[PDB]
């Protein structure tokens, strides 16, 4: 999946709140802050949901 | 920005899901009101923070019962960004809790407001502070927040701050008041980053919505 290799958009609203991203680099999910709005795909609430459908 | 002082604002209120996510404010006993991208499960409300990581003993923590995000909240244009969340038990109100009156008329272009909030304080960077930090900013013209944000700016959302960047409100902010001479008339929202030159900070336009909030208060 190649939204999973796209970097992490918090995106303009500002919330905190900590969702998941694949890091392809480091080949895990990671933790990022996302703003609460326009979420992109490289985007879950779980590592295990990040994981599941992007770890590769 | 800079530190309030503790109890300083006594309708700021903390969105907490394990961590604070959000902020609002206490506009009664037992509701809220903050953003509807703030919209999670499992909100407990935080009262009388000033350390929200420490307990300093002022605090009262209250589950949500109800959150109502606006009918028409626009998920894409972030327009009609307003939700209003019902506590469990009612709050007691006292001199470091209290709530914010909501607005008669809409605020005018160079009305200065206190913006207030628990979020990131570096422009480009990240540093989260312990305390509540507060932020004087004026309103802009509407003519000015358009030019800002060209196709994005609806009757609803006001820009605040200042052109030149350097002070604004940042991620962890949202849901937090916009007070001018005591009454509740902005939600911070959104923003092209932050303290960024020519991006002021986007607010919701609480003055069009003060006979949604009242009549949803009243039967909810
Ligand atoms: C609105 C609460 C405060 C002022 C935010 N979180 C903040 O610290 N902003 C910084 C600033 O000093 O204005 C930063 C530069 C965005
Ligand atoms: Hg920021």
């Known amino acids: 999946p190649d939204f999973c290799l796209e970097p992490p958009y918090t995106g303009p609203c500002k919330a905190r709140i900590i969702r998941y991203f694949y890091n392809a680099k480091a080949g895990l999910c990671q933790t990022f802050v996302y703003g609460g709005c326009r979420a992109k795909r490289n985007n879950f609430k779980s590592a295990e949901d990040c994981m599941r459908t992007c770890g590769g | ?220």
């Open chain 2, 1 to 220: 920005g800079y530190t309030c002082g503790a109890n300083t604002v006594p309708y700021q209120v903390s969105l907490n899901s394990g961590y604070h996510f959000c902020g609002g404010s206490l506009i009664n006993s037992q509701w809220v009101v903050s953003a509807a991208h703030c919209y999670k499960s499992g909100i407990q409300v935080r009262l009388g923070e000033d350390n929200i990581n420490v307990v300093e003993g002022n605090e009262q923590f209250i589950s949500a019962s109800k959150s109502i995000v606006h009918p028409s909240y626009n998920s894409n244009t972030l327009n009609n960004d307003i939700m209003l969340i019902k506590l469990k038990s009612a709050a007691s109100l006292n001199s470091r809790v209290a709530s914010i009156s909501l607005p008669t008329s809409c605020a005018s272009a160079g009305t200065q407001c206190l913006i207030s909030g628990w979020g990131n304080t570096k422009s480009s960077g990240t540093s989260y502070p312990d305390v509540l930090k507060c932020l004087k900013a004026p309103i802009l013209s509407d003519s000015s927040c358009k030019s800002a944000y060209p196709g994005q700016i609806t009757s609803n959302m006001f820009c605040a701050g200042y052109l030149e960047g350097g002070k604004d409100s940042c991620q962890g902010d949202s849901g937090g008041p916009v007070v001018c001479s005591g009454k509740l008339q902005g939600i911070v929202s959104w923003g092209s980053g932050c303290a960024q030159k020519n991006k002021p900070g986007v607010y919701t336009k609480v003055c069009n919505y003060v006979s949604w909030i009242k009549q949803t208060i009243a039967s909810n």
